[PDB]
A paper describes a structure:
The Omicron [name] variant likely originated through the recombination of two BA.2 descendants, BJ.1 and BM.1.1.1 a progeny of BA.2.7516. [name].1 is the variant most profoundly resistant to BA.2/5 breakthrough infection sera to date and is more fusogenic than BA.2.75.
S ectodomain was reconstructed as two closed states (closed-1 and closed-2) at resolutions of 2.50 Å and 2.51 Å, respectively. However, some differences were observed in both the S1 and S2 subunits in detail. This suggests that in closed-2, the fusion peptide could not adopt the stable conformation observed in closed-1 due to the movement of the SD1 domain. In closed-1, S383 of the RBD interacted with the main chain of D985 of heptad-repeat 1 (HR-1), but in closed-2, S383 and K386 of the RBD interacted with the side chain of D985 of HR-1. As a difference in interprotomer interactions between closed-1 and closed-2, protomer 1 F375 in closed-1 was located in a hydrophobic pocket formed by neighboring protomer 2 V407, V503, and Y508, and stacking interactions between protomer 1 P373 and protomer 2 H505 were also observed, while F375 in closed-2 was located in a hydrophobic pocket within the same protomer formed by V407 and Y508. The cryo-EM map in closed-1 showed a higher resolution, and the RBD was well packed, while that in closed-2 showed a relatively lower resolution in the RBD than in the whole map, suggesting that the RBD region is mobile. This further suggests that the loop containing F375 is trapped between protomers for packing in closed-1 but is flexible in closed-2.
Numbering used by the authors:
A (entry chain B): 753 to 1051
B (entry chain A): 554 to 620, 628 to 677, 689 to 802
C (entry chain A): 903 to 1139
The structure:
């Protein structure tokens, strides 16, 4: 194999580039603000109930109930943790695909940012947008009562403030009911989070196909190198080894190309998500159907 | 030792990749399991060679207690240089208790840097940002009294280099037998030329679309006075 | 002044602070050259394209010295050392390897071209929306409230200079949603009610400029028994 050029250096370079791009995507999406704001100890906002989205201090992970439901809904195969060689050597007579992948040179790297840091970023964004409105996205954060912010948003969509000030209780009750229905809607629907599951399914399928490809003959007498070496005369074994080498190189190149295309698509999706976070959360948008259906208020 | 229940007429055991993992001893009818010997990947963390020649080593996916090795060199562990992260085992760096901005990414929230403390290599947990807390009240507001004019820059790529390739010169050079042999391999080179030409045209299209918004060439007045603004 | 009116500030704020604004703009422009020169890795995105192209071409050239299982990497040696019907089996290996290298190079170039096209489309949209007009999209033409932008050309790319307005030196105040007077509720037309401790004024949004409360800058449109947190004072005519 040493005399077939530098294909493997190119493969390693492409994989490293994809790995770096993933962390860049996450950082660009989730690190808009550099200040960690905290919610006030007293939770009164004019009758608006935000308990379903604020972090829950009782549980160790400090996640909101909706985030807990979301994390329980999606099933993950490998998290990049230490799938230690000690775990694979345990020989529990139940051989999973992870050990087979690991025994053939295929590994998974952990992301730079943990889930706790992402939760902290989300909590900071929520606290800022609840206590300051849209001021903290353009400079220093300025305090303001929540109903006044809501009236300002109604003025933004083209309705006078007395409409809000004379219907505060009804609006608060409607918002509370709408928030309450979200958890039931998410739980009842079985295929709500299909987009997130598709990525995991695609990655697992690609790795399994790559592992399964090792049992092909590619026109040789056997798919095992040791059998060829032990059964054949040394100058005659190269013509059989070359076929296997070429087939495996072709499989690796196909895998790398597919990974590159999928990475480009994921990068486009991440850019869209970052734009949505900048425009619908840190401000009020007038673009039609960009931050929901209807007249946008907040997100 | 093997816990598998081989049938009396079976002699071998295979896995998904179709390689042997269970065997039966020819002399004593006993089942044995075969596992690959320990292995892993190694990464090197260093500042620039212009700064120092010190390095740190990261063994990926390896528990710190399981470290004739394939690499001849060995980095020997002292009392404090060994650290364990969810990304592997780190040797040659000291884990400090402070937090700074990330300098060299390592793993799950762990970064490394070169610090003067005697200069050394340290490892830490990255800091998200400065702590803050805005006071909230339901009868209080904050209003600015001054302003600041700021100017910022943004850089964006537009186009790249346009290249062309000659198949016959690259593959066969001046040989005639090679060209005759290549002539019967189809029309791959026509496709290659078409793709390269398409890319070359697209580059010029990109530049034209970016930089040709207006079709009138305006000129600045000879007298440069704009109310005190300096351009 | 029209741009300040666009971001939500009255014109007299500019007309009474023309010299200060001009000096701030001049200093901000002056600092740009120093900031660009001092930073060594400011223009990394533009250098990455050149580095990638050079590396790809160098790899393609270096690939010509591989054997691909043949006896030599030079066609002349094979032709001069081997019997003519036996030389094809050696030439074919080299041909196939070089074809594979060319195909790999072309695929990489296509993917990079797609990425560059996306970047160019974004740059064209930014030029249309931030330079030829004033944008209200948050964080699209800089950080802060957008005023205007200037383009500059760079090798294989463009540079945008965004000018933005940032508030500073805030102060606390006491506020109320409505003012009660003669059994009627008054709401501000534009701005917010503010109290310094004894009196009540009405001010605008992003700049502190108190005014006497009057029927000229308020509308009544309601009664004084349903608004929560109302404060009663006097309204002049
Ligand atoms: C905000 O909503 C939550 C959930 O609807 C309320 O929590 C409920 O409180 C009642 C009375 O204390 C309990 O019987 C329920 O079991 C709680 N539900 C959950 C899911 O914990 C909460 O009280 C609301 N906020 C306020 C201020 O009333
Ligand atoms: C708003 O900020 C500007 C700039 O920070 C202030 O202008 C400065 O004022 C001080 C005090 O007179 C002078 O010593 C500086 O030379 C001024 N700077 C410039 C660039 O002119 C301005 O005074 C502030 N506004 C108020 C009302 O205090
Ligand atoms: C606009 O700014 C430039 C640069 O800050 C000024 O040019 C300077 O002018 C002074 C006095 O003529 C010279 O001593 C400097 O050497 C010049 N700097 C440069 C870089 O050439 C220019 O004068 C300013 N415009 C006006 C109208 O004053
Ligand atoms: C709040 O603002 C009002 C309006 O300016 C202040 O009242 C003035 O105070 C000055 C200072 O003594 C007097 O000269 C004026 O005659 C007052 N105005 C009127 C209409 O009588 C008031 O002092 C301010 N309160 C605080 C705490 O600063
Ligand atoms: C093979 O020979 C050895 C030594 O003579 C003996 O211990 C063993 O049981 C034999 N095995 C069989 C299968 O005959
Ligand atoms: C590493 O080995 C020690 C030794 O007992 C063990 O306690 C620890 O759980 C191991 N760590 C992992 C991640 O397997
Ligand atoms: C690091 O700081 C934490 C903060 O309380 C402390 O509990 C811990 O003991 C410190 N560790 C060392 C090694 O000083
Ligand atoms: C908000 O208003 C309520 C009135 O129900 C009051 O009890 C509370 O103290 C107010 N908030 C603050 C921060 O004073
Ligand atoms: C406003 O008051 C709060 C609480 O007293 C304080 O934290 C804040 O610094 C004050 N704002 C200014 C601009 O002084
Ligand atoms: C004005 O407000 C005060 C304080 O709440 C209240 O006691 C008084 O009754 C109000 N005036 C009228 C005419 O209701």
């Amino acid at each position: 194999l040493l005399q077939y050029g530098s294909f493997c250096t190119q493969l390693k370079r492409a994989l490293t580039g994809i790995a770096v791009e993933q962390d860049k995507n996450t950082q660009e999406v989730f690190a808009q603000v550099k200040q960690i704001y905290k919610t006030p100890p007293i939770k009164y906002f004019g009758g608006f109930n935000f308990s379903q989205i604020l972090p829950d201090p009782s549980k160790p992970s400090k996640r909101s109930p909706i985030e807990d439901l979301l994390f329980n809904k999606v099933t993950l195969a490998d998290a990049g943790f230490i799938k230690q060689y000690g775990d694979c050597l345990g020989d529990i007579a139940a051989r999973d695909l992870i050990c087979a992948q690991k025994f053939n040179g295929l590994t998974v790297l952990p992301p730079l940012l943990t889930d706790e840091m992402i939760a902290q970023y989300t909590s900071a964004l929520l606290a800022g947008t609840i206590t300051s409105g849209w001021t903290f996205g353009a400079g220093p954060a300025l305090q303001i009562p929540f109903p006044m912010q809501m009236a300002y948003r109604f003025n933004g969509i083209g309705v006078t403030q007395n409409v809000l000030y004379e219907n505060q209780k009804l609006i608060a009750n409607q918002f509370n009911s709408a928030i309450g229905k979200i958890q039931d809607s998410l739980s009842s629907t079985p295929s709500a989070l299909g987009k997130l599951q598709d990525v995991v399914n695609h990655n697992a399928q690609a790795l399994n196909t790559l592992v399964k490809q090792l049992s092909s003959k590619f026109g040789a007498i056997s798919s095992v190198l040791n059998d060829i070496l032990s059964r054949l005369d040394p100058p005659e074994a190269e013509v059989q080894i070359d076929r296997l080498i070429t087939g495996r190189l072709q499989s690796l190149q196909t895998y790398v190309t597919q990974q590159l295309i999928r990475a480009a698509e994921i990068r486009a999706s991440a850019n869209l998500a970052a734009t949505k976070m900048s425009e619908c959360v840190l401000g009020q948008s007038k673009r039609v159907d960009f931050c929901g259906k209807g007249y946008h208020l907040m997100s | 030792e093997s816990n598998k229940k081989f049938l009396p007429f079976q002699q071998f055991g295979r896995d998904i990749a179709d390689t042997t993992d269970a065997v039966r001893d020819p002399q004593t009818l006993e089942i044995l399991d075969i596992t690959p010997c320990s292995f892993g990947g190694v990464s090197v963390i260093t500042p620039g060679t212009n700064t120092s020649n010190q390095v740190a080593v990261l063994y990926q996916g390896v528990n710190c207690t399981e470290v004739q090795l394939t690499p001849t060199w060995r980095v020997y562990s002292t009392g404090s240089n060994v650290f364990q992260t969810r990304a592997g085992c780190l040797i040659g760096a000291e884990y400090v208790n402070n937090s700074y901005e990330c300098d060299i990414p390592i793993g799950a929230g762990i970064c490394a840097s070169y610090q003067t403390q005697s200069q050394s290599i340290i490892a830490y947990t990255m800091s998200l940002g400065a702590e803050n807390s805005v006071a909230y009240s339901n009868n209080s507001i904050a209003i600015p009294t001054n302003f600041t004019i700021s100017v910022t820059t943004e850089i964006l790529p537009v186009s790249m280099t346009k290249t062309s390739v000659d198949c016959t010169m690259y593959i066969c050079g001046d040989s005639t037998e090679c060209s005759n042999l290549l002539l019967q391999y189809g029309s791959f080179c026509t496709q290659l030329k078409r793709a390269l030409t398409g890319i070359a045209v697209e580059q010029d299209k990109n530049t034209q679309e970016v930089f040709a918004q207006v079709k009138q060439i305006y000129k600045t007045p000879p007298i440069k006075y704009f109310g005190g603004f300096n351009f | 002044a029209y741009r300040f009116n666009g971001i939500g500030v009255t014109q007299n704020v500019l007309y009474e602070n023309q010299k200060l604004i001009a000096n701030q703009f001049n200093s901000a422009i002056g600092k740009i050259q120093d900031s660009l020169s001092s930073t060594p890795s400011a223009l990394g995105k533009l250098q990455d394209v050149v580095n990638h192209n050079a590396q790809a071409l160098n790899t393609l050239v270096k690939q010509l010295s591989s054997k691909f299982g043949a006896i030599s990497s030079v066609l002349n040696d094979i032709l001069s050392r081997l019997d003519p019907p036996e030389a094809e089996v050696q030439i074919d290996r080299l041909i196939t390897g070089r074809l594979q290298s060319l195909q790999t190079y072309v695929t990489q170039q296509l993917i990079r071209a797609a990425e560059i096209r996306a970047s160019a489309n974004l740059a064209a949209t930014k030029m249309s929306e931030c330079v030829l007009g004033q944008s209200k999209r948050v964080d699209f033409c800089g950080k802060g409230y957008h005023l205007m932008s200037f383009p500059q050309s760079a090798p294989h790319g463009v540079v945008f200079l965004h000018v933005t307005y940032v508030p500073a030196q805030e102060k606390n105040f006491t506020t109320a949603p409505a003012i009660c007077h003669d059994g009627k509720a008054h709401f501000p037309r534009e701005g917010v009610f503010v109290s310094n401790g004894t009196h009540w004024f009405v001010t605008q949004r992003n700049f502190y400029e108190p005014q006497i409360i009057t029927t000229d800058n308020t509308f009544v449109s309601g009664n004084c028994d349903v608004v929560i947190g109302i404060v009663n004072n006097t309204v002049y005519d």
